[PDB]
Amino acid sequence: EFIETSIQKVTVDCKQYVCNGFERCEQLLEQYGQFCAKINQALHGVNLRQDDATKSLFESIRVPQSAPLMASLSGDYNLSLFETPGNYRSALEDLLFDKVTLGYMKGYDECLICAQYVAGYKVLPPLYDSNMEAMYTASLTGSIAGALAASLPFAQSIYYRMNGIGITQNVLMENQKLIANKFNQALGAMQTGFTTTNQAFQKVQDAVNANAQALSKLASELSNTFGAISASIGDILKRLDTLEQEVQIDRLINGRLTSLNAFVSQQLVRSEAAARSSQLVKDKVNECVKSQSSRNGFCGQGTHIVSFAVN
Amino acid sequence: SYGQFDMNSGVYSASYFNAQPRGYYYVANELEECALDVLFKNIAPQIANYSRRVFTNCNYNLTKLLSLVEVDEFVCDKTTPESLATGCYSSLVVDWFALPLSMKSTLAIGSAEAISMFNYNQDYSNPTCRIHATINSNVSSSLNFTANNNYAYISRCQGTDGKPILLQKGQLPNIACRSGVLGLSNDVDYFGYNFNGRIFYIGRKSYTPRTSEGSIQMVYVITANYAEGPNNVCPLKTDNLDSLLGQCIDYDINGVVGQGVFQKCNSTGIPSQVFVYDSFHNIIGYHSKNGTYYCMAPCVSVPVSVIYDKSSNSHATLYGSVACDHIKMIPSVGLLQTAVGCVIGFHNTSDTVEDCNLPLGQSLCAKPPSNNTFGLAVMKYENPLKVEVLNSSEFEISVPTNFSFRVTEEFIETSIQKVTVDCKQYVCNGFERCEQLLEQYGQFCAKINQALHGVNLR
Amino acid sequence: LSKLASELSNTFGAISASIGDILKRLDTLEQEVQIDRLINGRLTSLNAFVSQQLVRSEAAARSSQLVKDKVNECVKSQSSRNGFCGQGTHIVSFAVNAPNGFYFVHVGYHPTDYVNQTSAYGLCDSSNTKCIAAKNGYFIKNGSDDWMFTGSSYYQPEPITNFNSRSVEPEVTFQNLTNNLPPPLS
Amino acid sequence: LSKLASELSNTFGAISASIGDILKRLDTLEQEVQIDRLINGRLTSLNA
Amino acid sequence: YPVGRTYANITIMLSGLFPHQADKGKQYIYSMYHMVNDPFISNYSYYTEPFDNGFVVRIGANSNITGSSVVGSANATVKKIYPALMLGSVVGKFPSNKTGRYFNHTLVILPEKCGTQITALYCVLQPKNQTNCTGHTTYTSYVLVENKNLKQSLQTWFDLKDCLFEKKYNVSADEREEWFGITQDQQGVHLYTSRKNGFKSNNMFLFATLPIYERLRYYTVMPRSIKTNDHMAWSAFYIYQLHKLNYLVEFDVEGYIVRASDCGANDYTQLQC
Ligand SMILES: *[C@@H]1O[C@H](CO)[C@@H](O[C@@H]2O[C@H](CO)[C@@H](O[C@@H]3O[C@H](CO)[C@@H](O)[C@H](O)[C@@H]3O)[C@H](O)[C@H]2NC(C)=O)[C@H](O)[C@H]1NC(C)=O
Ligand SMILES: *[C@@H]1O[C@H](CO)[C@@H](O[C@@H]2O[C@H](CO)[C@@H](O[C@@H]3O[C@H](CO)[C@@H](O)[C@H](O)[C@@H]3O)[C@H](O)[C@H]2NC(C)=O)[C@H](O)[C@H]1NC(C)=O
Ligand SMILES: Nc1nc(=O)c2nc(CNc3ccc(C(=O)N[C@@H](CCC(=O)O)C(=O)O)cc3)cnc2[nH]1
Ligand SMILES: *[C@@H]1O[C@H](CO)[C@@H](O[C@@H]2O[C@H](CO)[C@@H](O)[C@H](O)[C@H]2NC(C)=O)[C@H](O)[C@H]1NC(C)=O
Numbered sequence A: 001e002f003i004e005t006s007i008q009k010v011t012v013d014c015k016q017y018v019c020n021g022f023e024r025c026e027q028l029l030e031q032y033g034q035f036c037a038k039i040n041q042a043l044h045g046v047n048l049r050q051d052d053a054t055k056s057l058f059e060s061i062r063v064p065q066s067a068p069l070m071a072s073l074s075g076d077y078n079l080s081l082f083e084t085p086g087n088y089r090s091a092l093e094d095l096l097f098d099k100v101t102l103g104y105m106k107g108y109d110e111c112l113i114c115a116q117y118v119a120g121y122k123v124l125p126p127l128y129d130s131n132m133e134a135m136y137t138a139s140l141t142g143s144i145a146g147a148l149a150a151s152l153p154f155a156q157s158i159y160y161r162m163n164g165i166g167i168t169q170n171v172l173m174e175n176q177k178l179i180a181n182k183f184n185q186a187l188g189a190m191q192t193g194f195t196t197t198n199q200a201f202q203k204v205q206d207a208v209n210a211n212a213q214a215l216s217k218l219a220s221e222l223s224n225t226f227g228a229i230s231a232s233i234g235d236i237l238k239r240l241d242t243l244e245q246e247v248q249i250d251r252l253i254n255g256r257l258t259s260l261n262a263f264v265s266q267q268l269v270r271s272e273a274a275a276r277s278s279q280l281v282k283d284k285v286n287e288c289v290k291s292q293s294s295r296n297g298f299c300g301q302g303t304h305i306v307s308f309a310v311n
Numbered sequence B: 001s002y003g004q005f006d007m008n009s010g011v012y013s014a015s016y017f018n019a020q021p022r023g024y025y026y027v028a029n030e031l032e033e034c035a036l037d038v039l040f041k042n043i044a045p046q047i048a049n050y051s052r053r054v055f056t057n058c059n060y061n062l063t064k065l066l067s068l069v070e071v072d073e074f075v076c077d078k079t080t081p082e083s084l085a086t087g088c089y090s091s092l093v094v095d096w097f098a099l100p101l102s103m104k105s106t107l108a109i110g111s112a113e114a115i116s117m118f119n120y121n122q123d124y125s126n127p128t129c130r131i132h133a134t135i136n137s138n139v140s141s142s143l144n145f146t147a148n149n150n151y152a153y154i155s156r157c158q159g160t161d162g163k164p165i166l167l168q169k170g171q172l173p174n175i176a177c178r179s180g181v182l183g184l185s186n187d188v189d190y191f192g193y194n195f196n197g198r199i200f201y202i203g204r205k206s207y208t209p210r211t212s213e214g215s216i217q218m219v220y221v222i223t224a225n226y227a228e229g230p231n232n233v234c235p236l237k238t239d240n241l242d243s244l245l246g247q248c249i250d251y252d253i254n255g256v257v258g259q260g261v262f263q264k265c266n267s268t269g270i271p272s273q274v275f276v277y278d279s280f281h282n283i284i285g286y287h288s289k290n291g292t293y294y295c296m297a298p299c300v301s302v303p304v305s306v307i308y309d310k311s312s313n314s315h316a317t318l319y320g321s322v323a324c325d326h327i328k329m330i331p332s333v334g335l336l337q338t339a340v341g342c343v344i345g346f347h348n349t350s351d352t353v354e355d356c357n358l359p360l361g362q363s364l365c366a367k368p369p370s371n372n373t374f375g376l377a378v379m380k381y382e383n384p385l386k387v388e389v390l391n392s393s394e395f396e397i398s399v400p401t402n403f404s405f406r407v408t409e410e411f412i413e414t415s416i417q418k419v420t421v422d423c424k425q426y427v428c429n430g431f432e433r434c435e436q437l438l439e440q441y442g443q444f445c446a447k448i449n450q451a452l453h454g455v456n457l458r
Numbered sequence C: 001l002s003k004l005a006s007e008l009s010n011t012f013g014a015i016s017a018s019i020g021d022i023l024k025r026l027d028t029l030e031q032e033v034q035i036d037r038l039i040n041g042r043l044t045s046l047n048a049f050v051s052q053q054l055v056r057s058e059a060a061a062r063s064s065q066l067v068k069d070k071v072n073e074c075v076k077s078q079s080s081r082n083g084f085c086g087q088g089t090h091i092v093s094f095a096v097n098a099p100n101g102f103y104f105v106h107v108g109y110h111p112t113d114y115v116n117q118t119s120a121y122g123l124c125d126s127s128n129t130k131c132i133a134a135k136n137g138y139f140i141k142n143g144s145d146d147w148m149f150t151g152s153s154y155y156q157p158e159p160i161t162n163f164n165s166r167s168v169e170p171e172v173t174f175q176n177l178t179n180n181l182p183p184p185l186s
Numbered sequence D: 001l002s003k004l005a006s007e008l009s010n011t012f013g014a015i016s017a018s019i020g021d022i023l024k025r026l027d028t029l030e031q032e033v034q035i036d037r038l039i040n041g042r043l044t045s046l047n048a
Numbered sequence E: 001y002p003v004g005r006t007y008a009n010i011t012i013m014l015s016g017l018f019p020h021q022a023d024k025g026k027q028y029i030y031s032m033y034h035m036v037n038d039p040f041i042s043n044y045s046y047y048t049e050p051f052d053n054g055f056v057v058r059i060g061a062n063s064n065i066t067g068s069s070v071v072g073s074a075n076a077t078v079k080k081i082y083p084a085l086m087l088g089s090v091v092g093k094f095p096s097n098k099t100g101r102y103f104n105h106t107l108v109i110l111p112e113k114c115g116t117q118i119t120a121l122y123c124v125l126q127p128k129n130q131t132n133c134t135g136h137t138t139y140t141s142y143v144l145v146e147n148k149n150l151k152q153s154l155q156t157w158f159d160l161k162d163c164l165f166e167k168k169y170n171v172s173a174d175e176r177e178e179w180f181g182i183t184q185d186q187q188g189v190h191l192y193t194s195r196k197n198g199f200k201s202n203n204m205f206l207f208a209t210l211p212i213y214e215r216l217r218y219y220t221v222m223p224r225s226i227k228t229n230d231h232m233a234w235s236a237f238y239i240y241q242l243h244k245l246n247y248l249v250e251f252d253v254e255g256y257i258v259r260a261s262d263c264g265a266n267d268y269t270q271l272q273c
């Protein structure tokens, strides 16, 4: 299961988007009334809300105790996908960030992002680094197999998980090697063949594609003529007189401000969805990961045994 | 930008700054002078059979032409005569005929006379300029401008079925009716015509294009095509490439102006047509006359941000992804390199902080300046108390020995402000004119009132 | 409300934002155009406010559901799960009113100082006759194979009785003892 | 759905809410302005 | 191809004048002299198809292969042969009650000197009064003949008066297929050919703008035969009529078009556009 708990932190300014730096368009925007300061205030508010939500989510992720050695070696099951070692990143997180079509120290000197920089908007970096996020995730492992805190081997913990489901002691002690083989077979079946036909990876790619499509639309509403003679304020300035320039620049300003307001409303709606997604992620971590659930359906289909969380 | 003095402490975004264009470039490959003297050289054509010329790859000098005419009225859409003498366009199409100023409203848009429907019908899809010019007697005698005293226009063009033949926009008149009108020598209103088997009904009505003093009145319709390619029709009115590269530079190449940076890219696209465009109709390419392909880009702004600190009154500047190199080459419009970007303030510190109310980006903080500038603090993870896994039957536990209560305060906003807006009182201010225009605008106040009533009831 | 009431001073590309000023200054065929621009701007602002209220209604409804859950879980009862009612192990919760919402006061436990100790899965006698296991606690040793009982959240050892010890099925992973056995194992 | 289909009868400042009515009445230059106003109104309704 | 600009490595929804899907169009074939004297020709020249927005022809397809003579009883290889086209404004009836007479200024296109030169004459033709060459009730279709300047045959079949620009263009002699399109705008008539900008693909570019300000409404294909026992066969050129349609094309690294869906052939192409 994948739960998208993030929104893109995007800031747009006043005059680089509505105008292209011409003093005529800036003067006609100042006579048009003051709107873009509201845009900046709203975007700053939603970015601050998202950063505080991320901080609260990762505060709720944190465990008081952890066993780093348990995930690496102790389990007879091949749980090396969640074993952490450049990047302190597990195998599953590397597979996720590698098999999708998704840095900041020299992003200007590269030149898609430069198209955003000329269009008049940027994508802010996340509050936590990728290494810090991966290490916060890796700290969650090492407390999954702990309590019924006390550090436990993974095999004994799996025995205690399956004892309360309804499998008795003699059953599990009779064929424990078959249990390990079944667990390793399920983990290997998940690891291989999950990049072409599954709903969760399709949802990951859909979220990334939607986050790209929002910026693509925000940059593509610059070429709309909006009923004017041209989409460039330079051509309107050069071609028409000082009395008909006002009408066409007014139509252009109307179009760009409508696009900006639509993007701001889209960001608000996505933030309201991401807050609920963050609450659901907190609930799933505090129910299925650190403990064993008693209610079916809330931690996937079937009777729950164990759960892991990765970035 | 925000409009108030007292500001909460936090990192903001404080608008981009562009690089001003330093220099000039100009190619404007040389062309031939126009043949516009033909507009004043031969006999003035009548409206029924009016001449049309198309000028391409041409240069014209407007002062020499306008020294010969006296403009009485110009009607222009999507363009202006001031722009025609300064700007360069792709193609020029000129129609001209003789017409007195007493019927200057016959060619007006929306007229219902015989000229607008059986003679030259103007096309409004490209920028046009219909000019009513009067040529006086002295200049007309100088350039051998004469009147034939036989000027007429088609007043009826009917087929065999007794219905008029409307003329499509921007086309020459119907060849049968034009030939029938031209062949006659008098004025008729309903006259049969035998056009090699076809039975056409035509009507010829004459007019006088001169005046008492002998000055001849003319109508000059000028259509200018602004196309996406290079502009080769220019009015008559610095350095070389690779002396400039990577600098924002305004163009004057083939009548196309703008701003941006040139670079020497590999040849891409067809070599004949000069410019190369993308999907968003933005020019990105340029093929020189020497075969060198210059790839073109906009000169890109620098993304900046401001870190402000109240209770210390300190402001610092961060750059979004800009390296210290691009800080040094161009004006901004110590420099510590950071994973986010170079900062003009700040001082380095070998410090860590558990949490920061002033985040900078990827796990970087900005502590308040309590030497003389901010301190670049880096947040890093603290580790939980590690517990070892034991293979034996005895396992390590961690039983606490002391504790203290921690009060957690949570606020959950579960209400919205119940607001109702009077649409008539908000859109208008009680004026009857605005109320009538809102009523003719289509009603919206009922839907607004229903929506607010629904959300308040919910 | 400030953004709603600040759109009355926006000219929207007209001569003035006062309809009376437009009425006085301009003729009719331009009066309709200027008032049309004003009407477009004001109706766009009104529709933006309507969409804002409709968006905030869903967040208010979700927060109302969350407040109901928190009141029915952490206030009237002690929550077994951790993290849903504040940081730490929950003790008690008081709910009070707030401006446009509810204010929650959760009282956690938050252990401060920890002791590193070892413990077994359970204590059994000789040839696995009958074995016991801890009930809300852990088994601790003084160092001379003297098994004692301690709490799961505080260190104060007490002798093992039949009341904090629950009988469990024998296994192989338990620790077998020989001398000074606890009274439940005798 | 009722609000979606009720914006077809909105004149939006134009002379008539029917494009066929505008086409037979006004000239070529005013047709562009009136159809632009109508297009803006319908697109605003669709985006809403 | 788009006029005046180049696109590269992109896919554009652009609208203009293009032929639609399928639409094999009219199929025209020329033939040798009857096997010596009495050159063999087809029904053309009595058909005046409407010009509409314009047309585009496939020049010299089905060449370099083994085919068959139209009048011959045996098989022979086929080479590219350039069509000669008539374009005019008003059509009427001949004195022999046959169709194909153009009563005002007409544009003819003639390839000359074994395909080395092509000319465009805007040359209004009077019917010459002779025994069988467009006389009184003694008519067969005019045939443009040449040995193994076609204007001499035209002046034998027609009378030339008020002739204007005789623009001549140089085309190389080759057996590769080409394309040729005629489009009329308010700037005049536009001729398109595939030989400009090198010869790499089947796309056509603007290469001539003849000042034809009269609206062309009809066109016909004048018959042409070659004097040549010997068995020499000639290729086929197909005429496709343009339409006011919309397309979605794809550009490669070079300024050329690889594939181009037609928005309206079927519903899936409507989605694809
Ligand atoms: C467009 O056409 C006009 C003609 O009306 C050009 O104006 C001409 O400009 C030249 C030089 O600027 C003038 O020549 C000068 O003449 C004086 C004596 O009159 C002489 O002392 C100077 O040394 C120089 O030779 C010329 O007189 C003037 N023509 C008229 C009628 O005044 C104009 O230059 C043209 N535009 C362009 C861009 O060339
Ligand atoms: C029938 O056979 C003849 C062989 O003489 C074919 O002519 C050859 O056609 C190919 C088509 O790819 C030509 O290659 C191209 O040549 C151009 C020339 O500039 C070059 O730029 C391209 O990259 C490509 O290499 C080839 O040159 C041409 N041969 C000659 C001597 O010109 C003809 O195409 C065949 N016709 C059919 C319908 O198959
Ligand atoms: N004078 C003359 N000219 C010719 O072109 C000719 N062609 C043939 C036979 N050659 C041909 C020419 C074209 C196709 C043909 O039309 N090819 C395909 C197209 C398939 C498709 O549309 O993808 C076909 O329809 O089979 C077949 C045989 C015989 N005698 C001739 N004689
Ligand atoms: C109708 O107008 C056309 C175009 O202006 C005239 O055609 C010109 O006639 C002169 C004199 O014969 C020639 O020198 C030009 O070459 C012709 N130009 C073209 C484009 O054909 C035509 O003479 C006019 N008709 C009448 C009856 O005057």
Ligand SMILES: CCCCC/C=C\C/C=C\CCCCCCCC(=O)O
Pocket (backbone or CB within 6 Å): B105, B106, B111, B112, B113
């Ligand atoms: C001018 C006639 C006055 C009396 C007409 C009375 C009634 C007919 C009603 C409507 C048609 C009016 C035609 C207007 C033509 C003027 C424009 C022009 O010619 O360019």
Ligand SMILES: *[C@@H]1O[C@H](CO)[C@@H](O)[C@H](O)[C@H]1NC(C)=O
Pocket (backbone or CB within 6 Å): A078, A080, A188, A191
């Ligand atoms: C666990 O699985 C991975 C991939 O399936 C494999 O590379 C690794 O060797 C396995 N570990 C074992 C079998 O111990």
Ligand SMILES: *[C@@H]1O[C@H](CO)[C@@H](O)[C@H](O)[C@H]1NC(C)=O
Pocket (backbone or CB within 6 Å): B336, B337, B338, B348, B349, B350, B351
């Ligand atoms: C000083 O800044 C540099 C930036 O490259 C960094 O590498 C270094 O760790 C900093 N010194 C500290 C934090 O003591």
Ligand SMILES: *[C@@H]1O[C@H](CO)[C@@H](O)[C@H](O)[C@H]1NC(C)=O
Pocket (backbone or CB within 6 Å): B393, C126, C127, C128, C171, C172, C173, C174, C175, C176
């Ligand atoms: C303890 O002794 C019992 C006696 O049968 C045995 O079953 C059990 O396995 C022993 N446990 C260990 C850890 O040796």
Ligand SMILES: *[C@@H]1O[C@H](CO)[C@@H](O)[C@H](O)[C@H]1NC(C)=O
Pocket (backbone or CB within 6 Å): E009, E253
């Ligand atoms: C053309 O565009 C595609 C789009 O993904 C790109 O992958 C490719 O590198 C580009 N250049 C080519 C094909 O030379």
Ligand SMILES: *[C@@H]1O[C@H](CO)[C@@H](O)[C@H](O)[C@H]1NC(C)=O
Pocket (backbone or CB within 6 Å): E043, E046, E047
């Ligand atoms: C030949 O053309 C004439 C037109 O003059 C037409 O009537 C006849 O049907 C045509 N015959 C064939 C076989 O195409």
Ligand SMILES: *[C@@H]1O[C@H](CO)[C@@H](O)[C@H](O)[C@H]1NC(C)=O
Pocket (backbone or CB within 6 Å): B175, B178, B179, E103, E104, E105
């Ligand atoms: C067409 O030809 C006829 C033949 O006499 C001539 O009278 C007529 O003027 C011609 N058409 C034009 C437009 O000149």
Ligand SMILES: *[C@@H]1O[C@H](CO)[C@@H](O)[C@H](O)[C@H]1NC(C)=O
Pocket (backbone or CB within 6 Å): E169, E170
């Ligand atoms: C065309 O070819 C002829 C001879 O082949 C030559 O004299 C003439 O200059 C050529 N014209 C052009 C434009 O190449």
